[PDB]
C-alpha cells in the first residue's frame, strides 16, 4: 500500500558539435535526500553527472540549478528558465524526500539487528568480532580485569557486508598474561543492555 | 546528517547498460531489473511493506540515454578513465571448521561500471551458488560491488576472487585460505 515516488530526470540542453578496447561513456544521475533531526530539516539535491565529474546540481538550500563545471552552464540556464520545473524541484523536500522517508521508515530507519560478538586470539593479540548488526552506530570497549583499556585498541572500522548488516573487528594489543580476564563490551541500539563477553587465559 | 535516501541512475555506452536503484545510508533498498522490468528488493522482506511501479523507472533511463548522447557530443567524444578496482575478500562470520559461512568479495572504487567477477575454489571456476549485488554508487561517484559465495570451511580448500577490469593489465586474484583468515585485515 505504501508507494515509493520517483524523481523525474530532466533532459539536458541540445548544444554541441561532433567528432569521432572500445571507449566507454557514462552518465550518472543521483536524486539524493538528506535528513536532519529526524524529518525536521530536509536537503534535496538533484545532481547530474558525466563519468565521475559532477556537471549540474539543484540544491534545495539554493533554490535553483547551478553549474558545477563550465559544461553544465547551458543546462543550468535552460532548466531555471522553466518556471514550473523549479517549483517541483523546490517542493521535492516534501513531495518526494519526506514521502519516501515515511514509506520506508519501518524497515530502514527503525531497523534493528542484534550483533553477534566473538572473542579469539590470532597473529599474540586478541580480537573482538562483532558481526551482522544494523545500524552501524556501535561502541566497542576492551576491559582488562575490570579496567577499561583505552590504549592498544586498533579497530578495523565499520565494514559493510552489503546485506543491510555491518561487521567490525576490534583488536586489543595486550600480552595475554595468565589468569587475567579480558572483556569486550558492545553498545548498540538493537540491544536492551550492553553485551559483555569474557576470555580467561 | 542522520539519514540519506538516494535515487541513483546511470547509463553506459556502447554497452547500453542501465541502472535504477534506491539507496539508504550506503545499502540498497531496491533496484529495477532492466531485463524483466520489475522491482528487486535487496532484502526480500521489504516487498511486504512497500511497492514501486517499475515502468516509471524505465522512462527515467530513456532520458538518461538522451542526456548521455548530448554530453558525449558536448565533450568531443571524451572517454571515461578506466579506474582500477580495489578488492578484498572477507567472511561473513569468523570462520569455524564445518560451519556454514559466506565468502564476500568487496570490489570498490572503480569505474566504468563493468567488471567480470568469477569465484575459484582450488583453482576451478565455481558455477552455481553465487550471488551478486548491482553496482552500488559511491560518494566520490565511482562504484562498488558485492559478490557472495556461501561455503563450508575446511583446510583442504583455497579460494580466489578473480576480478577483471579494464583499469588492469591482468585479472586480479585475491586469495583466501583457512589458515590466513584475518591476515589481510
Amino acid at each position: 500500500a505504501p508507494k515509493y515516488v520517483k524523481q523525474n530526470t530532466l533532459k539536458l540542453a541540445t548544444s554541441g558539435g561532433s567528432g569521432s578496447t572500445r571507449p566507454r561513456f557514462l552518465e550518472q544521475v543521483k536524486h539524493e535526500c538528506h535528513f536532519f533531526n529526524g524529518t525536521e530539516r530536509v536537503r534535496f539535491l538533484d545532481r547530474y553527472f558525466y563519468h565521475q565529474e559532477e556537471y549540474v546540481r539543484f540544491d534545495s538550500d539554493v533554490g535553483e540549478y547551478r553549474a558545477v563545471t563550465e559544461l553544465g552552464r547551458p543546462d543550468a540556464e535552460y532548466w531555471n528558465s522553466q518556471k514550473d520545473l523549479l517549483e517541483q524541484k523546490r517542493a521535492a523536500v516534501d513531495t518526494y524526500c519526506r514521502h519516501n522517508y515515511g514509506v520506508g521508515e519501518s524497515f530502514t530507519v527503525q531497523r534493528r539487528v542484534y550483533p553477534e560478538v566473538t572473542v579469539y586470539p590470532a597473529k599474540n593479540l586478541l580480537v573482538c568480532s562483532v558481526n551482522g548488526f544494523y545500524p552501524g552506530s556501535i561502541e566497542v570497549r576492551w576491559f582488562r580485569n575490570g579496567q577499561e583499556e583505552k590504549t592498544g585498541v586498533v579497530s578495523t572500522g565499520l565494514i559493510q557486508n552489503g546485506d543491510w548488516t555491518f561487521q567490525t573487528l576490534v583488536m586489543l594489543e595486550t600480552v595475554p598474561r595468565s589468569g587475567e580476564v579480558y572483556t569486550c563490551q558492545v553498545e548498540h541500539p538493537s540491544l536492551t543492555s550492553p553485551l559483555t563477553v569474557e576470555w580467561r587465559a | 546528517e542522520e539519514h540519506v535516501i538516494i535515487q541513483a541512475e546511470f547509463y553506459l555506452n556502447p554497452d547500453q547498460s542501465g541502472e535504477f536503484m534506491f539507496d539508504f545510508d550506503g545499502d540498497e533498498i531496491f533496484h529495477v531489473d532492466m531485463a524483466k522490468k520489475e522491482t528487486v528488493w535487496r532484502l526480500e522482506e521489504f516487498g511486504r511493506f512497500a511497492s514501486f511501479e517499475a515502468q516509471g523507472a524505465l522512462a527515467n533511463i530513456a532520458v538518461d540515454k538522451a542526456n548521455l548522447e548530448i554530453m558525449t557530443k558536448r565533450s568531443n567524444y571524451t572517454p571515461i578513465t578506466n579506474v582500477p578496482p580495489e578488492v578484498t575478500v572477507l567472511t561473513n562470520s569468523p570462520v569455524e571448521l564445518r560451519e556454514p559461512n559466506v565468502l564476500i568479495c568487496f570490489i570498490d572504487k572503480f569505474t566504468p561500471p563493468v567488471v567480470n567477477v568469477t569465484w575459484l575454489r582450488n583453482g576451478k571456476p565455481v558455477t552455481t551458488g553465487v550471488s551478486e549485488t548491482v553496482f552500488l554508487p559511491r560518494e566520490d561517484h565511482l562504484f562498488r560491488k558485492f559478490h557472495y559465495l556461501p561455503f563450508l570451511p575446511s583446510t583442504e580448500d583455497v579460494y580466489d576472487c578473480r576480478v577483471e577490469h579494464w583499469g588492469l593489465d591482468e585479472p586480479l586474484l585475491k586469495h583466501w585460505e583457512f589458515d590466513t583468515s584475518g591476515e589481510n585485515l
Partner: antibody
Amino acid sequence: QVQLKESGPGLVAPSQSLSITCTVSGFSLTSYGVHWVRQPPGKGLEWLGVIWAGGSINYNSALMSRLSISKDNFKSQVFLKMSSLQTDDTAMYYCARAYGDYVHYAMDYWGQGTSVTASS
Amino acid sequence: DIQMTQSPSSLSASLGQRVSLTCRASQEISGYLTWLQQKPDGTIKRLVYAASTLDSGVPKRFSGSRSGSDYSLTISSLESEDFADYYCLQYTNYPLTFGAGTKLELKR
C-alpha cells in the same frame, strides 16, 4: 591515521651512499605500494621509482641502477639507496602511497619530505 | 618518457575568482592524470585523480576535466587557502612524469 614520514641523513658526501627510510602507519605494506619522488630546490618534481605491495619494483631508467628500493612489510617501512651521488642529487625526497600492484592505481597520501644535500 | 607541459606558469588572481590550469601530454595518457597542491611548507595534498575524480577532503570548487589530450583543473570561488603551487601528474606508464607547476598568487 594514514601517515608517511621520511627520515635520512641531512648531509651525505659525494661518491657515497644515501639511505632514506619511509616509515608508514595507518595502512599495511602488504596491500599498498610506496612511490619515491624528489624535488630539486626551485625546480619541479621527478619520479624515482616504486615498490608495490607484492614486491615488484619499477625504477626510472634514467637513474642507471643507482637506485635500490627495498621493503620490510613486518616493520612497515620502505627503504631507498642512492649510489654515486653527484651535486645534482641535492633535493627533497618524498614517498607516497598507492594501492595494489599496478601503475593505474593513483597515488594519494604523501609524506612530509626530507632534505638531502650532496656536497663535500 | 612522456612530456607534461603545464600552461599557466605564474597566474595571479583575486579572491572569489575562477582560474584554470592546463596540462597537456605529448603521448596519450588515457585519462590517468592527477592534480597536486603544494603549500609553501612542502605539504603535498592530492586534489583530483584519474582526470576528474574528486578526492575526499577536497571541496566542490575544485574540478578536473578532459577534452582530448587537454587536462584542466578549474578552481571556482578562489579562497585564501587555495593559493599555492600546483603540479599535474601522469601515471599511465613508467616513468611517472610531473608538470612544470603553477604559482598561484592572491592579488590584494
